[PDB]
Design a protein around this ligand. Structure first.
Ligand SMILES: O=C(Nc1ccc2c(c1)CN(S(=O)(=O)c1cccc(C(F)(F)F)c1)CCO2)c1c(F)cccc1Cl
Ligand SMILES: O=C(Nc1ccc2c(c1)CN(S(=O)(=O)c1cccc(C(F)(F)F)c1)CCO2)c1c(F)cccc1Cl
Lengths: 236, 13, 229
Protein backbone atom coordinates (compact mmCIF):
# COMPACT_ATOMS: atom_id res chain seq x y z
CA UNK A 1 0.00 0.00 0.00
CA UNK A 2 1.34 3.38 -1.20
CA UNK A 3 0.54 6.88 0.19
CA UNK A 4 -2.18 7.26 -2.50
CA UNK A 5 -3.93 3.93 -1.79
CA UNK A 6 -3.97 4.57 2.01
CA UNK A 7 -5.31 8.09 1.54
CA UNK A 8 -8.03 6.88 -0.80
CA UNK A 9 -9.05 4.26 1.87
CA UNK A 10 -9.28 7.11 4.50
CA UNK A 11 -11.45 9.32 2.22
CA UNK A 12 -13.67 6.37 1.25
CA UNK A 13 -14.25 5.20 4.90
CA UNK A 14 -15.05 8.83 5.85
CA UNK A 15 -17.44 9.19 2.88
CA UNK A 16 -19.19 5.84 3.73
CA UNK A 17 -19.60 7.10 7.31
CA UNK A 18 -20.97 10.54 6.22
CA UNK A 19 -23.55 8.75 3.97
CA UNK A 20 -24.70 6.30 6.73
CA UNK A 21 -24.35 8.34 10.01
CA UNK A 22 -28.21 8.50 10.34
CA UNK A 23 -28.23 11.84 12.21
CA UNK A 24 -26.05 14.76 10.95
CA UNK A 25 -23.65 16.24 13.53
CA UNK A 26 -24.88 19.81 12.65
CA UNK A 27 -28.52 18.78 13.45
CA UNK A 28 -27.54 16.98 16.72
CA UNK A 29 -25.42 19.96 17.92
CA UNK A 30 -28.04 22.64 17.13
CA UNK A 31 -30.72 20.58 19.02
CA UNK A 32 -28.62 20.43 22.28
CA UNK A 33 -30.76 23.46 23.40
CA UNK A 34 -34.02 21.46 22.86
CA UNK A 35 -34.22 19.68 26.29
CA UNK A 36 -37.27 17.59 27.50
CA UNK A 37 -39.38 19.40 30.16
CA UNK A 38 -40.10 17.90 33.64
CA UNK A 39 -43.64 17.08 32.38
CA UNK A 40 -42.25 15.29 29.30
CA UNK A 41 -39.75 13.31 31.48
CA UNK A 42 -42.65 12.23 33.83
CA UNK A 43 -44.58 11.28 30.68
CA UNK A 44 -41.81 8.84 29.67
CA UNK A 45 -41.46 7.58 33.25
CA UNK A 46 -45.23 6.72 33.43
CA UNK A 47 -45.04 4.50 30.33
CA UNK A 48 -44.92 0.74 30.72
CA UNK A 49 -41.53 -0.97 30.38
CA UNK A 50 -43.33 -2.62 27.35
CA UNK A 51 -44.04 0.76 25.69
CA UNK A 52 -40.39 1.91 26.41
CA UNK A 53 -39.03 -1.41 25.08
CA UNK A 54 -40.91 -1.14 21.78
CA UNK A 55 -39.87 2.55 21.22
CA UNK A 56 -36.19 1.72 22.12
CA UNK A 57 -36.07 -1.57 20.16
CA UNK A 58 -37.48 0.35 17.13
CA UNK A 59 -34.73 3.06 17.33
CA UNK A 60 -32.09 0.33 17.96
CA UNK A 61 -33.21 -1.71 14.88
CA UNK A 62 -32.95 1.48 12.81
CA UNK A 63 -29.44 2.32 14.22
CA UNK A 64 -28.28 -1.25 13.40
CA UNK A 65 -29.61 -0.92 9.77
CA UNK A 66 -27.36 2.19 9.29
CA UNK A 67 -24.32 0.27 10.71
CA UNK A 68 -24.99 -2.63 8.26
CA UNK A 69 -25.13 -0.05 5.40
CA UNK A 70 -21.79 1.41 6.59
CA UNK A 71 -20.16 -2.10 6.62
CA UNK A 72 -21.43 -2.84 3.05
CA UNK A 73 -19.74 0.38 1.78
CA UNK A 74 -16.31 -0.61 3.25
CA UNK A 75 -13.69 -1.90 0.74
CA UNK A 76 -13.45 -5.67 0.68
CA UNK A 77 -16.41 -6.22 3.11
CA UNK A 78 -18.72 -7.13 0.20
CA UNK A 79 -16.03 -9.50 -1.21
CA UNK A 80 -15.93 -11.54 2.03
CA UNK A 81 -18.11 -14.68 2.11
CA UNK A 82 -21.72 -14.22 3.51
CA UNK A 83 -20.64 -16.24 6.61
CA UNK A 84 -17.77 -13.81 7.47
CA UNK A 85 -20.02 -10.81 6.72
CA UNK A 86 -22.56 -12.18 9.24
CA UNK A 87 -19.85 -13.05 11.83
CA UNK A 88 -18.36 -9.48 11.69
CA UNK A 89 -21.80 -7.75 11.89
CA UNK A 90 -23.23 -10.12 14.58
CA UNK A 91 -20.18 -9.47 16.76
CA UNK A 92 -19.67 -5.74 16.03
CA UNK A 93 -22.81 -3.90 14.82
CA UNK A 94 -24.09 -3.24 18.43
CA UNK A 95 -20.63 -2.10 19.54
CA UNK A 96 -20.63 0.40 16.59
CA UNK A 97 -24.08 1.68 17.68
CA UNK A 98 -22.63 2.25 21.23
CA UNK A 99 -19.68 4.22 19.72
CA UNK A 100 -21.95 6.30 17.36
CA UNK A 101 -24.09 7.29 20.43
CA UNK A 102 -21.38 9.76 21.70
CA UNK A 103 -22.37 12.11 18.80
CA UNK A 104 -25.94 12.43 20.17
CA UNK A 105 -24.58 12.84 23.73
CA UNK A 106 -24.07 16.25 25.45
CA UNK A 107 -21.44 15.95 28.26
CA UNK A 108 -22.31 19.36 29.80
CA UNK A 109 -25.79 18.34 31.13
CA UNK A 110 -25.34 14.50 30.71
CA UNK A 111 -28.22 14.25 28.22
CA UNK A 112 -28.80 12.20 25.07
CA UNK A 113 -30.84 12.84 21.94
CA UNK A 114 -33.94 10.67 22.10
CA UNK A 115 -37.17 10.96 20.10
CA UNK A 116 -36.62 14.59 18.96
CA UNK A 117 -35.18 16.15 22.13
CA UNK A 118 -32.36 15.83 24.71
CA UNK A 119 -32.95 14.01 28.01
CA UNK A 120 -31.05 12.49 30.92
CA UNK A 121 -30.93 8.81 31.88
CA UNK A 122 -34.04 9.32 34.16
CA UNK A 123 -36.13 9.27 30.91
CA UNK A 124 -35.52 5.45 30.79
CA UNK A 125 -36.68 4.70 34.41
CA UNK A 126 -39.56 2.37 33.27
CA UNK A 127 -37.06 -0.04 31.62
CA UNK A 128 -35.74 -1.00 35.10
CA UNK A 129 -32.19 -1.13 33.54
CA UNK A 130 -30.67 1.78 35.57
CA UNK A 131 -27.17 0.11 35.96
CA UNK A 132 -26.95 -0.68 32.19
CA UNK A 133 -28.25 2.80 31.19
CA UNK A 134 -25.76 4.44 33.59
CA UNK A 135 -22.88 2.40 31.97
CA UNK A 136 -24.09 3.48 28.46
CA UNK A 137 -24.10 7.18 29.56
CA UNK A 138 -20.60 6.71 31.28
CA UNK A 139 -19.10 5.17 28.09
CA UNK A 140 -20.60 8.03 25.97
CA UNK A 141 -19.29 10.53 28.58
CA UNK A 142 -15.74 9.09 28.34
CA UNK A 143 -15.74 9.20 24.47
CA UNK A 144 -17.10 12.77 24.32
CA UNK A 145 -14.07 13.98 26.40
CA UNK A 146 -11.84 12.86 23.43
CA UNK A 147 -13.68 15.36 21.10
CA UNK A 148 -13.84 12.56 18.46
CA UNK A 149 -14.09 14.05 14.99
CA UNK A 150 -16.51 12.52 12.42
CA UNK A 151 -13.54 11.05 10.53
CA UNK A 152 -12.00 9.55 13.71
CA UNK A 153 -15.38 7.82 14.47
CA UNK A 154 -15.62 6.54 10.83
CA UNK A 155 -12.13 5.05 11.02
CA UNK A 156 -12.45 3.76 14.60
CA UNK A 157 -15.88 2.11 13.95
CA UNK A 158 -14.55 0.55 10.69
CA UNK A 159 -11.89 -1.12 12.93
CA UNK A 160 -14.59 -2.17 15.49
CA UNK A 161 -16.22 -4.17 12.64
CA UNK A 162 -13.12 -5.32 10.72
CA UNK A 163 -11.60 -7.53 13.42
CA UNK A 164 -9.90 -10.83 12.48
CA UNK A 165 -10.28 -12.18 16.09
CA UNK A 166 -14.07 -12.83 15.76
CA UNK A 167 -14.74 -16.58 16.35
CA UNK A 168 -16.20 -18.44 13.35
CA UNK A 169 -14.41 -16.68 10.45
CA UNK A 170 -13.75 -18.91 7.42
CA UNK A 171 -11.41 -16.43 5.58
CA UNK A 172 -9.34 -15.15 8.64
CA UNK A 173 -6.34 -14.12 6.42
CA UNK A 174 -8.56 -11.83 4.20
CA UNK A 175 -10.07 -10.09 7.31
CA UNK A 176 -6.49 -9.69 8.77
CA UNK A 177 -5.33 -7.94 5.60
CA UNK A 178 -8.44 -5.68 5.54
CA UNK A 179 -7.94 -4.86 9.29
CA UNK A 180 -4.24 -3.88 8.84
CA UNK A 181 -5.05 -1.66 5.84
CA UNK A 182 -7.68 0.15 7.94
CA UNK A 183 -5.22 0.33 10.93
CA UNK A 184 -2.60 1.88 8.57
CA UNK A 185 -5.28 4.27 7.24
CA UNK A 186 -6.36 5.26 10.80
CA UNK A 187 -2.71 5.78 12.06
CA UNK A 188 -1.75 7.69 8.86
CA UNK A 189 -4.81 9.99 9.24
CA UNK A 190 -4.05 10.60 12.96
CA UNK A 191 -0.49 11.66 11.89
CA UNK A 192 -1.90 14.07 9.17
CA UNK A 193 -4.32 15.69 11.64
CA UNK A 194 -1.82 15.84 14.61
CA UNK A 195 -4.15 13.51 16.54
CA UNK A 196 -1.65 10.74 17.51
CA UNK A 197 -2.64 11.42 21.22
CA UNK A 198 -6.12 9.82 20.85
CA UNK A 199 -4.82 6.21 20.45
CA UNK A 200 -3.82 5.88 24.12
CA UNK A 201 -7.13 7.62 25.18
CA UNK A 202 -9.38 5.12 23.26
CA UNK A 203 -11.43 2.68 25.46
CA UNK A 204 -9.74 -0.75 25.89
CA UNK A 205 -11.13 -3.27 23.24
CA UNK A 206 -12.66 -5.32 26.15
CA UNK A 207 -14.68 -2.33 27.49
CA UNK A 208 -16.99 -2.04 24.38
CA UNK A 209 -17.28 -5.88 24.21
CA UNK A 210 -18.46 -6.34 27.85
CA UNK A 211 -20.92 -3.35 27.59
CA UNK A 212 -22.32 -4.96 24.37
CA UNK A 213 -22.70 -8.34 26.20
CA UNK A 214 -24.42 -6.65 29.23
CA UNK A 215 -26.78 -4.87 26.75
CA UNK A 216 -27.62 -8.08 24.71
CA UNK A 217 -28.45 -9.98 28.02
CA UNK A 218 -31.10 -7.32 28.95
CA UNK A 219 -32.39 -6.97 25.32
CA UNK A 220 -33.11 -10.76 25.18
CA UNK A 221 -35.45 -10.80 28.27
CA UNK A 222 -37.49 -8.04 26.51
CA UNK A 223 -37.72 -9.47 22.91
CA UNK A 224 -38.58 -12.94 24.42
CA UNK A 225 -42.03 -11.52 25.45
CA UNK A 226 -42.48 -8.60 22.95
CA UNK A 227 -41.30 -8.91 19.27
CA UNK A 228 -41.92 -6.00 16.80
CA UNK A 229 -41.90 -5.44 12.97
CA UNK A 230 -40.11 -2.13 12.13
CA UNK A 231 -39.85 -0.60 8.59
CA UNK A 232 -36.43 -0.66 6.88
CA UNK A 233 -35.15 2.34 4.84
CA UNK A 234 -32.32 1.60 2.23
CA UNK A 235 -30.55 0.01 0.03
CA UNK A 236 -29.38 1.71 -3.30
CA UNK B 1 -33.01 -12.79 -1.51
CA UNK B 2 -29.33 -12.92 -0.14
CA UNK B 3 -28.05 -14.48 3.20
CA UNK B 4 -27.24 -11.09 4.96
CA UNK B 5 -30.73 -9.56 4.21
CA UNK B 6 -32.26 -12.83 5.60
CA UNK B 7 -30.00 -12.78 8.70
CA UNK B 8 -30.94 -8.99 9.28
CA UNK B 9 -34.70 -9.94 8.92
CA UNK B 10 -34.26 -12.76 11.52
CA UNK B 11 -32.11 -10.71 13.91
CA UNK B 12 -32.91 -6.98 13.63
CA UNK B 13 -31.28 -6.75 17.13
CA UNK C 1 -35.25 -29.56 20.02
CA UNK C 2 -39.12 -29.50 19.45
CA UNK C 3 -42.14 -31.96 19.52
CA UNK C 4 -42.54 -31.52 15.71
CA UNK C 5 -38.94 -32.76 15.11
CA UNK C 6 -40.45 -36.25 15.42
CA UNK C 7 -43.83 -37.53 14.19
CA UNK C 8 -46.77 -35.80 15.87
CA UNK C 9 -50.07 -37.57 16.87
CA UNK C 10 -53.36 -36.35 15.25
CA UNK C 11 -54.19 -34.24 18.39
CA UNK C 12 -50.76 -32.51 18.08
CA UNK C 13 -51.52 -32.07 14.28
CA UNK C 14 -54.76 -30.21 15.04
CA UNK C 15 -52.79 -27.93 17.45
CA UNK C 16 -50.26 -27.34 14.63
CA UNK C 17 -53.16 -26.30 12.25
CA UNK C 18 -54.56 -23.80 14.79
CA UNK C 19 -51.10 -22.41 15.57
CA UNK C 20 -50.05 -21.98 11.86
CA UNK C 21 -53.38 -20.21 11.23
CA UNK C 22 -52.87 -17.93 14.27
CA UNK C 23 -49.26 -17.12 13.22
CA UNK C 24 -50.56 -16.22 9.73
CA UNK C 25 -53.40 -13.99 11.14
CA UNK C 26 -50.84 -12.11 13.29
CA UNK C 27 -48.32 -11.56 10.39
CA UNK C 28 -50.54 -11.17 7.24
CA UNK C 29 -49.58 -7.39 7.08
CA UNK C 30 -52.89 -6.36 5.45
CA UNK C 31 -56.26 -7.69 6.79
CA UNK C 32 -58.38 -9.50 4.15
CA UNK C 33 -61.51 -7.49 5.22
CA UNK C 34 -59.62 -4.15 4.64
CA UNK C 35 -58.25 -5.37 1.24
CA UNK C 36 -61.76 -6.44 0.06
CA UNK C 37 -63.27 -3.12 1.42
CA UNK C 38 -60.68 -1.07 -0.57
CA UNK C 39 -61.46 -2.79 -3.97
CA UNK C 40 -63.71 0.26 -4.75
CA UNK C 41 -60.76 2.72 -4.15
CA UNK C 42 -59.18 2.62 -7.68
CA UNK C 43 -56.32 5.00 -8.85
CA UNK C 44 -57.59 7.77 -11.18
CA UNK C 45 -56.16 8.24 -14.76
CA UNK C 46 -54.28 11.31 -13.37
CA UNK C 47 -52.78 9.24 -10.52
CA UNK C 48 -51.74 6.45 -12.97
CA UNK C 49 -50.01 9.09 -15.26
CA UNK C 50 -48.36 10.43 -12.10
CA UNK C 51 -46.78 7.00 -11.39
CA UNK C 52 -45.88 6.55 -15.08
CA UNK C 53 -43.94 9.91 -15.10
CA UNK C 54 -41.71 8.86 -12.19
CA UNK C 55 -38.20 7.69 -12.89
CA UNK C 56 -37.50 3.93 -12.92
CA UNK C 57 -35.22 4.92 -9.94
CA UNK C 58 -38.07 6.32 -7.91
CA UNK C 59 -40.39 3.33 -8.82
CA UNK C 60 -37.55 0.94 -7.86
CA UNK C 61 -37.11 2.61 -4.44
CA UNK C 62 -40.92 2.58 -3.68
CA UNK C 63 -41.26 -1.09 -4.83
CA UNK C 64 -38.02 -2.30 -3.12
CA UNK C 65 -39.32 -0.61 0.10
CA UNK C 66 -42.71 -2.42 -0.13
CA UNK C 67 -40.95 -5.69 -0.96
CA UNK C 68 -38.51 -5.40 2.03
CA UNK C 69 -41.54 -4.79 4.29
CA UNK C 70 -43.48 -7.81 2.81
CA UNK C 71 -40.37 -10.01 3.35
CA UNK C 72 -40.11 -8.86 7.00
CA UNK C 73 -43.74 -10.08 7.63
CA UNK C 74 -42.87 -13.47 6.00
CA UNK C 75 -39.78 -13.74 8.29
CA UNK C 76 -42.07 -12.98 11.29
CA UNK C 77 -44.50 -15.73 10.10
CA UNK C 78 -41.59 -18.26 9.81
CA UNK C 79 -40.31 -17.39 13.34
CA UNK C 80 -43.79 -18.14 14.78
CA UNK C 81 -43.91 -21.66 13.19
CA UNK C 82 -43.28 -24.56 15.66
CA UNK C 83 -39.72 -25.80 15.52
CA UNK C 84 -38.50 -23.07 13.06
CA UNK C 85 -36.61 -21.15 15.80
CA UNK C 86 -35.18 -24.51 17.11
CA UNK C 87 -33.50 -25.08 13.73
CA UNK C 88 -29.87 -23.87 13.47
CA UNK C 89 -29.37 -20.26 12.17
CA UNK C 90 -27.91 -21.74 8.92
CA UNK C 91 -31.11 -23.76 8.14
CA UNK C 92 -33.30 -20.80 9.13
CA UNK C 93 -31.38 -18.63 6.60
CA UNK C 94 -31.47 -21.35 3.91
CA UNK C 95 -35.30 -21.82 4.22
CA UNK C 96 -36.04 -18.05 4.22
CA UNK C 97 -33.49 -17.19 1.42
CA UNK C 98 -35.05 -19.87 -0.78
CA UNK C 99 -38.75 -19.31 0.13
CA UNK C 100 -39.62 -15.81 1.49
CA UNK C 101 -40.09 -14.24 -1.97
CA UNK C 102 -42.18 -17.21 -3.10
CA UNK C 103 -44.40 -16.64 0.02
CA UNK C 104 -44.62 -12.92 -0.86
CA UNK C 105 -45.82 -13.88 -4.40
CA UNK C 106 -48.48 -16.24 -2.89
CA UNK C 107 -49.68 -13.63 -0.28
CA UNK C 108 -50.12 -11.07 -3.18
CA UNK C 109 -53.32 -12.84 -4.48
CA UNK C 110 -55.16 -11.49 -1.36
CA UNK C 111 -54.43 -7.86 -2.55
CA UNK C 112 -55.38 -8.75 -6.12
CA UNK C 113 -58.87 -8.09 -7.68
CA UNK C 114 -59.50 -10.53 -10.60
CA UNK C 115 -62.58 -8.59 -11.86
CA UNK C 116 -60.62 -5.48 -13.08
CA UNK C 117 -57.08 -7.05 -12.95
CA UNK C 118 -55.90 -4.50 -10.31
CA UNK C 119 -53.59 -4.83 -7.33
CA UNK C 120 -53.44 -2.93 -4.05
CA UNK C 121 -50.45 -0.61 -4.18
CA UNK C 122 -49.64 2.40 -1.95
CA UNK C 123 -53.22 2.81 -0.58
CA UNK C 124 -55.31 2.18 -3.73
CA UNK C 125 -55.97 -0.40 -6.48
CA UNK C 126 -54.25 -0.13 -9.87
CA UNK C 127 -53.52 -2.18 -12.99
CA UNK C 128 -50.07 -3.23 -14.25
CA UNK C 129 -49.78 0.08 -16.27
CA UNK C 130 -48.93 1.78 -12.91
CA UNK C 131 -45.47 0.09 -13.12
CA UNK C 132 -44.61 1.26 -16.72
CA UNK C 133 -41.45 3.22 -15.63
CA UNK C 134 -39.81 0.03 -14.32
CA UNK C 135 -39.43 -1.29 -17.89
CA UNK C 136 -40.23 -4.83 -16.51
CA UNK C 137 -43.44 -5.38 -18.60
CA UNK C 138 -42.94 -9.20 -19.03
CA UNK C 139 -42.16 -9.78 -15.33
CA UNK C 140 -45.07 -7.56 -14.09
CA UNK C 141 -47.46 -9.32 -16.52
CA UNK C 142 -46.32 -12.77 -15.19
CA UNK C 143 -46.84 -11.56 -11.56
CA UNK C 144 -50.41 -10.40 -12.41
CA UNK C 145 -51.09 -13.73 -14.35
CA UNK C 146 -49.90 -15.87 -11.36
CA UNK C 147 -52.05 -13.77 -8.95
CA UNK C 148 -54.99 -14.13 -11.40
CA UNK C 149 -54.63 -17.94 -11.44
CA UNK C 150 -54.38 -18.17 -7.56
CA UNK C 151 -57.42 -15.88 -7.01
CA UNK C 152 -59.53 -18.43 -9.00
CA UNK C 153 -58.92 -20.98 -6.17
CA UNK C 154 -60.77 -18.68 -3.64
CA UNK C 155 -58.04 -19.57 -1.11
CA UNK C 156 -59.24 -19.14 2.46
CA UNK C 157 -56.94 -17.44 5.03
CA UNK C 158 -56.23 -20.82 6.66
CA UNK C 159 -55.45 -22.50 3.33
CA UNK C 160 -52.88 -19.69 2.55
CA UNK C 161 -51.35 -20.02 6.08
CA UNK C 162 -50.91 -23.78 5.65
CA UNK C 163 -49.82 -23.65 2.01
CA UNK C 164 -47.22 -20.84 2.65
CA UNK C 165 -45.93 -22.74 5.76
CA UNK C 166 -45.20 -25.65 3.32
CA UNK C 167 -43.59 -23.23 0.75
CA UNK C 168 -41.06 -22.36 3.54
CA UNK C 169 -40.71 -25.73 5.30
CA UNK C 170 -39.12 -27.67 2.45
CA UNK C 171 -36.41 -30.28 3.22
CA UNK C 172 -35.20 -30.21 -0.46
CA UNK C 173 -33.53 -26.74 -0.15
CA UNK C 174 -29.81 -27.12 -0.98
CA UNK C 175 -27.46 -26.25 1.91
CA UNK C 176 -29.43 -27.62 4.90
CA UNK C 177 -27.31 -28.98 7.76
CA UNK C 178 -30.19 -30.61 9.77
CA UNK C 179 -32.28 -31.89 6.80
CA UNK C 180 -33.92 -34.61 8.99
CA UNK C 181 -35.35 -32.01 11.42
CA UNK C 182 -36.79 -30.01 8.42
CA UNK C 183 -38.24 -33.31 7.00
CA UNK C 184 -40.04 -34.05 10.30
CA UNK C 185 -41.42 -30.50 10.47
CA UNK C 186 -42.48 -30.71 6.78
CA UNK C 187 -44.20 -34.13 7.22
CA UNK C 188 -46.25 -32.82 10.15
CA UNK C 189 -47.28 -29.67 8.21
CA UNK C 190 -48.26 -31.78 5.11
CA UNK C 191 -50.54 -34.00 7.20
CA UNK C 192 -51.84 -30.84 9.01
CA UNK C 193 -52.70 -29.31 5.60
CA UNK C 194 -54.32 -32.52 4.15
CA UNK C 195 -56.20 -33.15 7.43
CA UNK C 196 -57.56 -29.56 7.49
CA UNK C 197 -58.64 -29.82 3.80
CA UNK C 198 -60.58 -33.03 4.72
CA UNK C 199 -62.32 -31.26 7.71
CA UNK C 200 -63.44 -28.40 5.47
CA UNK C 201 -64.31 -30.54 2.35
CA UNK C 202 -61.61 -28.65 0.43
CA UNK C 203 -59.59 -31.65 -0.88
CA UNK C 204 -60.25 -30.25 -4.46
CA UNK C 205 -57.66 -27.44 -4.01
CA UNK C 206 -54.62 -29.84 -3.96
CA UNK C 207 -54.88 -30.54 -7.73
CA UNK C 208 -55.46 -26.77 -8.39
CA UNK C 209 -52.24 -25.66 -6.57
CA UNK C 210 -49.43 -24.22 -8.84
CA UNK C 211 -47.17 -26.90 -10.41
CA UNK C 212 -43.59 -27.85 -9.39
CA UNK C 213 -41.23 -25.02 -10.39
CA UNK C 214 -43.91 -22.30 -11.08
CA UNK C 215 -43.28 -20.21 -7.88
CA UNK C 216 -39.46 -20.87 -8.08
CA UNK C 217 -39.14 -19.78 -11.79
CA UNK C 218 -41.11 -16.53 -11.13
CA UNK C 219 -39.03 -15.75 -7.98
CA UNK C 220 -35.75 -16.32 -9.97
CA UNK C 221 -37.02 -14.09 -12.88
CA UNK C 222 -37.83 -11.50 -10.13
CA UNK C 223 -34.42 -11.61 -8.26
CA UNK C 224 -32.59 -11.22 -11.69
CA UNK C 225 -34.40 -7.88 -12.44
CA UNK C 226 -33.94 -6.68 -8.78
CA UNK C 227 -30.12 -7.30 -9.06
CA UNK C 228 -29.92 -4.68 -11.94
CA UNK C 229 -31.84 -2.18 -9.75
O1 LIG D 1 -32.77 1.40 24.50
C1 LIG D 1 -32.01 0.46 24.67
N1 LIG D 1 -30.84 0.24 23.99
C2 LIG D 1 -30.30 1.10 23.02
C3 LIG D 1 -28.94 1.33 23.00
C4 LIG D 1 -28.40 2.15 22.04
C5 LIG D 1 -29.23 2.75 21.11
C6 LIG D 1 -30.59 2.53 21.13
C7 LIG D 1 -31.13 1.69 22.08
C8 LIG D 1 -31.50 3.15 20.12
N2 LIG D 1 -31.67 4.63 19.99
S1 LIG D 1 -32.66 5.28 21.26
O2 LIG D 1 -33.65 4.32 21.73
O3 LIG D 1 -33.07 6.59 20.78
C9 LIG D 1 -31.62 5.61 22.68
C10 LIG D 1 -30.95 6.82 22.69
C11 LIG D 1 -30.11 7.10 23.75
C12 LIG D 1 -29.98 6.22 24.79
C13 LIG D 1 -30.68 5.03 24.79
C14 LIG D 1 -30.49 4.13 25.96
F1 LIG D 1 -29.90 4.77 27.01
F2 LIG D 1 -31.65 3.62 26.45
F3 LIG D 1 -29.70 3.06 25.69
C15 LIG D 1 -31.51 4.71 23.73
C16 LIG D 1 -30.37 5.25 19.59
C17 LIG D 1 -29.14 4.92 20.43
O4 LIG D 1 -28.69 3.59 20.14
C18 LIG D 1 -32.32 -0.54 25.71
C19 LIG D 1 -31.55 -0.60 26.86
F4 LIG D 1 -30.51 0.22 27.01
C20 LIG D 1 -31.85 -1.52 27.85
C21 LIG D 1 -32.93 -2.37 27.70
C22 LIG D 1 -33.70 -2.32 26.56
C23 LIG D 1 -33.39 -1.40 25.57
CL1 LIG D 1 -34.34 -1.37 24.16
O1 LIG E 1 -42.34 -4.30 -7.43
C1 LIG E 1 -41.54 -5.22 -7.58
N1 LIG E 1 -41.49 -6.39 -6.86
C2 LIG E 1 -42.47 -6.77 -5.93
C3 LIG E 1 -43.10 -8.00 -6.02
C4 LIG E 1 -44.04 -8.36 -5.08
C5 LIG E 1 -44.35 -7.48 -4.06
C6 LIG E 1 -43.73 -6.25 -3.97
C7 LIG E 1 -42.78 -5.90 -4.91
C8 LIG E 1 -44.02 -5.28 -2.87
N2 LIG E 1 -45.38 -4.70 -2.69
S1 LIG E 1 -45.74 -3.48 -3.89
O2 LIG E 1 -44.51 -2.87 -4.38
O3 LIG E 1 -46.81 -2.69 -3.32
C9 LIG E 1 -46.44 -4.24 -5.35
C10 LIG E 1 -47.79 -4.53 -5.38
C11 LIG E 1 -48.32 -5.14 -6.49
C12 LIG E 1 -47.52 -5.44 -7.58
C13 LIG E 1 -46.18 -5.11 -7.55
C14 LIG E 1 -45.36 -5.44 -8.74
F1 LIG E 1 -46.16 -5.67 -9.81
F2 LIG E 1 -44.44 -4.49 -9.08
F3 LIG E 1 -44.65 -6.58 -8.57
C15 LIG E 1 -45.63 -4.51 -6.44
C16 LIG E 1 -46.33 -5.79 -2.32
C17 LIG E 1 -46.44 -7.00 -3.24
O4 LIG E 1 -45.30 -7.85 -3.10
C18 LIG E 1 -40.52 -5.10 -8.64
C19 LIG E 1 -40.75 -5.67 -9.88
F4 LIG E 1 -41.86 -6.38 -10.12
C20 LIG E 1 -39.82 -5.53 -10.89
C21 LIG E 1 -38.66 -4.80 -10.68
C22 LIG E 1 -38.43 -4.23 -9.45
C23 LIG E 1 -39.35 -4.38 -8.43
CL1 LIG E 1 -38.98 -3.66 -6.90
Amino acid sequence: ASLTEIEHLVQSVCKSYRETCQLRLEDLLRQRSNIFSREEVTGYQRKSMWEMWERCAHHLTEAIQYVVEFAKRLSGFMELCQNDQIVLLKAGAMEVVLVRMCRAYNADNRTVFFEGKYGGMELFRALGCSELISSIFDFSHSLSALHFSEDEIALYTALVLINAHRPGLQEKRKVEQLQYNLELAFHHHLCKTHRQSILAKLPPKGKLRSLCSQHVERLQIFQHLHPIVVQAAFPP
Amino acid sequence: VERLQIFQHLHPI
